[PDB]
Structure formats: C-alpha cells, structure tokens
C-alpha cells in the first residue's frame, strides 16, 4: 500500500496472505476388452499375439 508522507492519520492497511489450491483426481479407467468363443479361439485365432495382444 501507499500512504501520503506525514499524513495526520497513521493507520495501516494490513495485507492478507491467502494460499490457494486445486485438486487433481484419478477418475477414468481406459480399457480394451476382447471376447472369444471356444470356436473363435480354436479355429479363427492363429497367433493370438499379433492377432489379439498387439491390436
């Protein structure tokens, strides 16, 4: 603050120290899910690593 020098009133405006904050939340669940019948897994899958896991 500023006040006039040699001012008849001698009051001072006390300043405030306010700490702020914000929250960071873990709030999402990203997933990839696959369903294979016994026929699909037995007959239609050949590698399962370059055909299921890599995709």
């Amino acid at each position: 603050n500023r006040r006039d020098l040699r001012d008849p009133d001698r009051t001072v405006i006390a300043s405030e120290l306010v700490e702020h904050s914000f929250g960071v939340t873990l709030d999402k669940h990203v997933y990839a899910a696959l369903k294979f019948t016994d026929e699909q897994r037995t007959l239609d899958i050949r590698d399962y690593t370059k055909q299921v896991l890599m995709p």
Binding site: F36, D38, E39, R41, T42, L43, I45, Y48
Partner: peptide, 8 residues
C-alpha cells in the same frame, strides 16, 4: 475332429 484349444 478338432480338439479345442485351452485358452489363456
């Protein structure tokens, strides 16, 4: 005949 595979 085709034996089913045992999955992961």
């Amino acid at each position: 005949y085709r034996t089913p595979v045992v999955p992961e």
